[PDB]
Symmetry: D2
Subunit: 505 residues, 4 copies
């Protein structure tokens, strides 16, 4: 008999786990418990801070919510107006010395006229081809060229996506992009070229909110805090080392054993196969493919430069910098960096030179957060990547050579992106149902490995819906039909459902 | 204060309401009650019997289930193996002296060769058009022609559907037919013609089950019996006469008032609007179109004739009979008609003449169930429709002139089919959200008026899902996404969910 | 017995008749003779002159030759280098205040951007339709819209062609435009728009040559002069009044009768039918359609204005002027108008004012030649057309209100354009075979009525090939296969053939 | 000074050369002369006879005339109605034990039904592809598959054309086949399959006429006989051994020298180059490809078998016989073989064995003419080809094993077919202009090497038109525009033209 017995055990306290925990707590029927090897919940949606006081998320994290349930839990966790800052979704592509507003193809009027000719000719070919197309594209690359034409594909989406996924576009599937037909909007693109028009895809109704304090990690600390503490085990005491699927028993690192009836596992599924000592499953999970994420943070002295402005996140297809995305993290919250009165010496200049004195000077400060991908097809020299990033900041005119850097941050995250390879679905259909038949719900960004439902809201809801399937026989819609949940407003499920209203009478 | 108060009131004890009640009963959370004006549950899924002992459903009723929950409840209600009979899904189209196996287009090799040429030529046009098509069809009629070509369309789907819907095919929408591309399988059709194939689309795979006793109606009597009797109110005592939406009160025939927090109404939504005395809603519901259904039943003396055989249901596009569909109802169960030793006189011969004797003679007996549609665009003379049907049976060679008729049956059902008109959705998206804002879930064949989710299993699950929305925040998939639920096996929701397992432990 | 007898008689000494005569003269086999009612040869390729010394062709006459034979005869007739002036084929379309270089669609960057957007959208539509086209266009109008798209059609080719043909574009055939597929060059059009580029379809190798003296009329006087004078009969003495097909006898106005074995008739085929007193042919030829041509000339004082420059001919789609084409005839040769020392009084200003002084002043002078069409669907007020043309010159900014007009010219030509109506070929293929059966070769712009082989070189060769068919059994390729002769340089037939070389030896 | 001087010299007295002779003789202008190394005119359109009295053409020779001029000369040469026999153009394809009427694809209803399905499926693919096609086929093979689909292509046109051309379909061009669109008549082909119908492409108005005596060779002997004898030189005395193009001198084998002004050469152009000792032209003409033709004749005892009947010529796609075509030559004329009264011994039985009796016996007799091709890509065993042919006749059921063979014939013609390779035109446009520059008109089947104008009538007119170009400046239409002359009735040029009529007056 194990030390502890619950109906439903949840492994992991990132968004997916916390989602399961929240729904279990709401339903208040089956017994449950949640464990995590980290003392601080949040997983990949956590936040670090440098010794100089600059915060960094695990890369650019912008919330877009497809679900009212997710909203409910965030509102409950951070109920005050001044718990949040609201920003428009402002983004650009760096290309040929220019900041080109998203969406890229609608804004190529910024490029030289000869580039415009190349871009439109390419898209004309794609339009005429789309007119007689009667097959869906098989790879990501085919999708891109059918959607954009050669010229435009080559300027942005092809080289950008290699820098992101650390595999060639030709190696990825394309179903994960949705059911929209791969064909260009020739008229829209040429109309903006003729008119000499730029138009970004944001405005007063395209916004996001970001926590006032603690970065993205502040959300999940606050959400976890609404759970009954005696049902959590966070830290070394909550680290899973063994999963005996046949016994329905989990062993923690300190020797604690937990018997369960149903298992919701949100750790990476390759890690779960190892913890299960299941050589068949280990074999299968090793066929999955993922990339690692290097997060680089740069803290900079000065009031925000005009060239930077209200920019939120930025894309970099070109090979004059190693990162694929930059985030002006200091724009998200004034508390992502020190106040202007805080004194800090200059660590280095952007040109790499190490400055005159050790004099601590005042602010204000601003902050850049960068992401570089790594995989077996794309190695990264960890010793030089910080310096290479900083030079990239100078090449892209984000920093002047003389800009003063007062803090740096670098951290490698092993599992960063679950890759939509051609082989992904074939491998998953061999893994997830096998786990299912042992009463294991493996779910999450790496729990079920599907990037298209891999955001904080998706993840949270994969946990919520797993519980709902376990308890109420609900359909796991986010897991099995990403196009369905991404194409609608999911308003039906709330943090207070009729069941709780009726019961409280 | 009302005579009775419940959390959830269900109006109607046809399949939809019984679905709602079964789910309420399983959850055993909020209090509830179900009412019906009829002492016998079942609605349009009920069964009548003639004084001579011939059973008739409300037209041809064949169950194809898309849901495990539905199967669960049927198994619970009729658990013995000999509660059911299994049959292959055998259907034909009557065309030009021929019984043509479904699907019609795959079996036109039974038609004269000159007409096969016309058909194939037409379908060749349709295939060539579909290759360059860049729009969806807008009407039922365009869908038919794109799928079949002109010639095949003119032989079956066009004239048949007018005889069913009692509106032209040009006046209906086609979204209700699902998302498959409107395009011909030219190779399948020509292959069968060239090979002279007459192959029906049924086998050991394609089966249905039918109750051993009581007709389709026996299913719903059995399901209803699993409900706690004291929470039911069936008969004149259960007739709703008034719905006060603003006070959330219902008033019955005898004067009983019932307060509710949430209402699930499965009566026809135009009757609901009148019962609400809501003038705006009355106006909107009068804009919905529907056809009435006449059910004619004929009991015949004799062992099953060879020409009839294992036939189950039959379509009639042609002009020599008033019915659109016939069912060999005596094939569905040997208890649908009297035993061989039962003695009955002959009422008439099929050509209308008087029998040589009025004495009672023994059987065996077989039985025919027919359907005739009625609408404002298509009157039906009640006084002659029985005789016209019987003449139809001679014209179609289902009966010889000499066949002895020992029982007849006719009944008119006012609300028969909810019509998928072009206007339907425009009207419905104004009705249902208004009822929704008053905590009224109007659901069912005429509760929500959508034929594509209008079968017994669909209806039952509309009730089930309305309750799941009310109590557990579930998405109403069957109501809002017909294509979704019809295109998959719906296995997650069971009559025993985790919720009940965990509680009983 | 008649007054004269020849093997081959040619009626008419325009380009077609002179072609017949040159070939007969070269062959020097059968006896022949040519007649015309005008003392001066040349027909519609003749030239008039005002009392003030301004020459005018019958509207814009620019030579492009498809034949080395035609070249030989022109070179023979005007053998000196200073008999000719060479120019680039410079043309523009007047549209919304602008002179738009031909071809129009390649130069719409000069229009407002909003209008460019509509043009390009229309041509995108046309390109996509062209990609799946499987039928030929049936009308001139369909051909135009399939080539340009709606927007560009409406700006130029639709309204311009009504002003030319004096019939709607929907009433004309399009086979006459040749075998090229009706499809747009979308890339060419969008490329020039994107580059803000203008580009005419002329250059150092896209030229024409014009006669130094006497205008186009000089060519045919010179050609005629190479014939044996006693085989010609020009003037009132050469006017044909009657043609007796059955006796093969022509009667002239002074009563002279001519016997022939074969007849080459280049008069308008509807005049020929009347001359034949053939009521059937009269009926048939009356079914043909043609428009009349008003030629208006304006002599202007002053050196060539900068705004005019090297412009040769000009198209006018718009409703602010009555002419469809303008020619800067003073650019074709310095001898088309008086020398600068010549003194002329000013007749009126361009705005209609009297001049300040009626004294004769010197030049230099320049000169504009205009064309206005007339038909039963488009009447022309003969009394006001000159003043209307001059007002039109101000509206289009060719003349300033102050410009001094010193000479005017107006002549109406009954048969100007033979119209490629839908009915043309149906009619012609009854007329020409009946004439052929009578040994009558009816050939020429109105002799055989096909505009696509209606230029000077075509006409000339129609007469040559008619002779060659009569004598040597040659195919009449220009007559029957316009696309053939227009699509190649016809080099085989020369003014000196092998027959004449071997003969002299 | 040479031994003889003429204006025009004609080398060769096959149909091309004789065409040039006949036209020069008609024109009666320049002096001329025609030479041939054979005493008997006709070239590849001549006829051999066996010692047993069986005639054989050089393979199947059936005349279809595109030209009135050709008809005139044939009529002149053989003016009596008993000089000719008329037959319907009856042909079949031998396929899977059956004689299938031409055209093959309209008659596949004769094949097994499963095979018909495969044929129709293939042609459906081809129809759907043709509907969106916007490129022209580049190879013979590509053309075939687009016209017929894969199934039908593999049954006949692909294997047949390899047996004919002795090169793969993938290595030949397809322009030579005309301008018709490469697309299937799906409706026609499926209609005949559905109706179970066969239909040949012959009847009362689809006939050919054949000479009563002397085989096809009798035409050209007779046509030659109408020429002035003194202007001809046929035999060893007329064999050309040297051409000196710079001297315009030809030397014959007996050392006679002829000077010319213009040369019409109808010998194979690769032989012409050698005779010119022009190393450059030799190099180029060696780039042309051609196949050799083996003619085999078999004379058979007995009246014409029922299985043979009215069959004229036959196609053999399959591997069980080496020949690609067979002609029932005894059907073309009763005088193509001995009369019944003629006594001949049996040489062998069709199974290859010795006859029972060696005694001469009577007829009647019939006769089969076979064609086998050969090239560097398809070698033929010359030593066994007769026996292999006769076994092929047994394999195809044209001959019974017991049939008695009374005469055999075999002859190899080195230059049999000028092959339409992909390279043909690139080479010819290097050859023909270079010869033209030297006043050499190289014309005819191997004179100018274009199979699409390589029949007797084409050849004859290539000679006629070359002369017409030389003397009257005519366009060489047959040479340069095969589609033009083949797509019309060429009626303008007659054996008596206007020139001769007017001269006789």
């Amino acid at each position: 008999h194990p030390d502890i017995s619950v109906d439903v055990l949840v492994i992991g306290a990132g968004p997916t786990g916390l989602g399961a925990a929240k729904r279990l707590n709401q339903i208040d029927g089956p017994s449950w418990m949640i464990v995590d090897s980290n003392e601080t919940p949040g997983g990949l949606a956590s936040t670090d801070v440098t010794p100089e006081g600059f915060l960094y998320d695990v890369g650019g994290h912008v919330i877009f919510s497809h679900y009212k349930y997710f909203d409910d839990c965030l509102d409950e966790a951070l109920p005050k107006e001044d718990d949040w800052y609201t920003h428009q979704r402002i983004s650009y592509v760096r290309c040929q010395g220019q900041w080109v507003p998203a969406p890229f193809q609608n804004n190529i009027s910024m490029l030289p006229k000869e580039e415009q000719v190349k871009c439109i000719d390419g898209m004309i070919d794609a339009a005429l081809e789309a007119r007689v197309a009667n097959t869906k594209p098989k790879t990501f690359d085919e999708w891109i060229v059918r959607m954009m034409g050669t010229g435009i594909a080559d300027l942005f989406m092809r080289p950008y996506n290699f820098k992101v996924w650390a595999v060639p576009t030709t190696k990825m599937q394309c179903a994960w992009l949705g059911e929209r037909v791969a064909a260009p909007n020739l008229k829209a693109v040429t109309t903006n070229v003729i008119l000499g028009k730029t138009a970004g895809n944001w405005g007063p109704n395209a916004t996001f909110r970001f926590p006032a304090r603690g970065g993205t990690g502040g959300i999940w600390i606050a959400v976890a805090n609404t759970l009954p503490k005696e049902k959590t085990r966070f830290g070394e005491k909550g680290k899973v080392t063994k999963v005996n699927a046949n016994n329905k028993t989990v062993t923690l690192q300190d020797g604690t054993t937990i018997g369960y009836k149903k298992l919701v596992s949100t750790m990476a599924v390759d890690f779960l196969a190892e913890a299960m000592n299941d050589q068949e499953l280990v074999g299968l999970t090793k066929q999955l493919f993922y990339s690692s994420t290097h997060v680089i943070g740069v803290g900079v002295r000065g009031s925000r430069p005009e060239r930077i402005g209200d920019k939120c996140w930025l894309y970099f297809p070109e090979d004059n910098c190693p990162f694929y995305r930059a985030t002006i993290f200091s724009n998200y919250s004034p508390y992502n960096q020190p106040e202007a009165s805080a004194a800090l010496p200059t660590m280095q200049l952007a040109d790499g030179s190490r400055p005159q004195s050790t004099e601590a000077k005042e602010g204000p400060y601003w902050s850049i957060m960068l992401e570089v991908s790594e995989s077996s097809m794309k190695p990264v020299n960890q010793e030089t990547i910080l310096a290479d990033c900083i030079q990239g900041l100078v090449n892209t005119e984000m920093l002047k050579p003389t800009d003063e850097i007062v803090s740096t941050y670098h951290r490698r995250f092993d599992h960063g992106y679950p890759t939509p390879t051609l082989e992904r679905e074939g491998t998953l259909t061999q893994i997830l149902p096998k786990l299912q038949d042992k009463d294991i719900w493996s779910r999450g960004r790496f729990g079920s490995w599907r990037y298209e439902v891999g955001n904080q809201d998706h993840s949270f809801m994969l946990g919520v819906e797993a519980v709902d399937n376990i308890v109420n026989g609900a359909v796991e819609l986010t897991l099995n039909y990403p196009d369905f949940v991404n194409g609608r407003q999911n308003t039906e499920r709330r943090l207070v459902d009729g069941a709780q209203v009726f019961a409280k009478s």
